[PDB]
């Protein structure tokens, strides 16, 4: 699921891609951490949740 998006995805609009996102100013350039997070997160469907 998508968490970090520059704007609001348009209606019926599919952001069909997995690109590393860039949060506030700390140049990521392919790394994750300080203001750098991967916008697509695996939820994990455990039926007993």
């Amino acid at each position: 699921y998508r968490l970090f998006r520059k704007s609001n995805l348009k209606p019926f609009e599919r952001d069909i891609s997995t690109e590393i996102y860039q949060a506030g100013s700390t140049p990521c350039n392919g790394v994750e951490g300080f203001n750098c997070y991967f916008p697509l997160q695996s939820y994990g469907f455990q039926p007993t949740n």
């Binding site: 506030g24 100013s25 700390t26 300080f34 203001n35």
Partner: protein, 42 residues
């Protein structure tokens, strides 16, 4: 407790500082006070 009131708290410069370790949380929100603590952990 460094509780502060009626101050212009610039979170953007602090958040966009690149001289921290963990920002586990801003300038568009105003609050009654900020119970800003201070200590060192291992």
């Amino acid at each position: 407790r460094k509780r502060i009131s009626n101050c212009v708290a610039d979170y953007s410069v602090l958040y966009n500082s690149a001289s921290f370790s963990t920002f586990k949380c801003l300038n568009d929100l105003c609050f009654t006070n900020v119970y800003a603590d201070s200590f060192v952990i291992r």
